[PDB]
Structures are given as structure tokens and as C-alpha cells.
Amino acid sequence: NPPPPETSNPNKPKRQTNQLQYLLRVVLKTLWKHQFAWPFQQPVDAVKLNLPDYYKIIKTPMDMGTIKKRLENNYYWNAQECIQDFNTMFTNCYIYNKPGDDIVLMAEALEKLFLQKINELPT
Ligand SMILES: CCOc1c(OC)ccc2c1Oc1c(OC)ccc3c1C(=C2)N(C)C3=O
């Protein structure tokens, strides 16, 4: 396993916005409770899951546990930076797998719910 993505970085500037607060309180914390959220709640453990190929394929890993910690740390500058991490998480799953796979059906459902929730953000 590679080290997981950073959740703090002292030389990166922090920020808190209404949209970032919403991304934690509403978007992440609601998606977290979905029946399909469990594979996406922590970094992929390639040793545990017996996927020695995972990090040979996926070079920018991302997961909701990392995103949650970043939001709690005020790690992001703006909501778009956080949204990009969600999009990276979804696209990694499409890249690593193939259409119709159970894990892909899970990501597809979560992506739709994510888009529903971010369609309208606070001002
Ligand atoms: C059966 C293992 O389930 C787990 C799980 O278990 C604690 C924890 C994380 C994952 C996971 O499953 C899979 C797969 O399973 C065959 C196949 C592909 C992917 C994942 C996955 C998340 N991601 C992100 C994938 O791209």
C-alpha cells in the first residue's frame, strides 16, 4: 500500500466557506449513510483486499474518508476543490473496474446522488 492521501498540509492555505460547510454537513454525511457507501469510506487497502494491481492502475487515489478528514481540517480552498476529489473517487472506480461490475453500479448510484446534492449549493 502507498501512504494514503494527505489530510493536512501546513504550507497549503486553509479556508472555510458556506459551500464547504454544506459539503461536509449535507453532501458527505448523507452519502456516507447510503447502502452503497461502504467501499468508498476509506482508502483501498490493496493488501487486505488482495488487489496488488490496484495502485499499479490508480495513481490519484481518493475516498470519502479522506474527503471527510479534509473537510474537517479546512484543508480545501473552495467547494470546487472538494468536488474534484469526489469526481476523482468516482472516475477511479470506473477506470479500475469495467461496466456492469457490482462496484461500478454502486459508484454510478452514488454519483447520481452526489450530483443531485451539489446541483444547488448555499450562496
Ligand atoms: C470485496 C471488497 O470490498 C471492498 C471493501 O471491503 C472492505 C473496501 C473497499 C472497496 C471494496 O471493493 C472493491 C472491489 O471489490 C471486488 C472492486 C473494485 C473496487 C472496490 C473498491 C472499494 N473500489 C474503490 C474499487 O474500485
Residue numbers in the entry: 44 to 166
Provide passages from the article that reported this PDB entry.
To verify the specific binding of inhibitors to Brd4 bromodomain and obtain the structural information to develop further optimized inhibitors, we determined five three-dimensional structures of Brd4 bromodomain–inhibitor complexes. In contrast to 8ab structure, the structures of 8bc, 8bf, and 8be contain an ordered water molecule forming a water-mediated interaction between the side chain amine of Gln85 and oxygen atom of 6-ether at R4 position. The formation of π-stacking interaction between phenol ring of the core structure and indole group of Trp81 is also a remarkable feature of these inhibitors. However, the five benzooxepino[4,3,2-cd]isoindol-2(1H)-one inhibitors formed fewer hydrophobic interactions with protein residues than JQ-1, which is likely due to the chemical structural planarity of inhibitors compared with JQ-1.
There are several bromodomain subfamilies; Brd2, Brd3, Brd4, and the testis-specific protein Brdt belong to the bromodomain and extra-terminal (BET) family. These two loops and their neighboring regions form a highly hydrophobic pocket, which is known to be the acetylated lysine binding pocket. Brd4 acts as an important mediator of transcriptional elongation through recruiting the positive transcription elongation factor complex (P-TEFb).
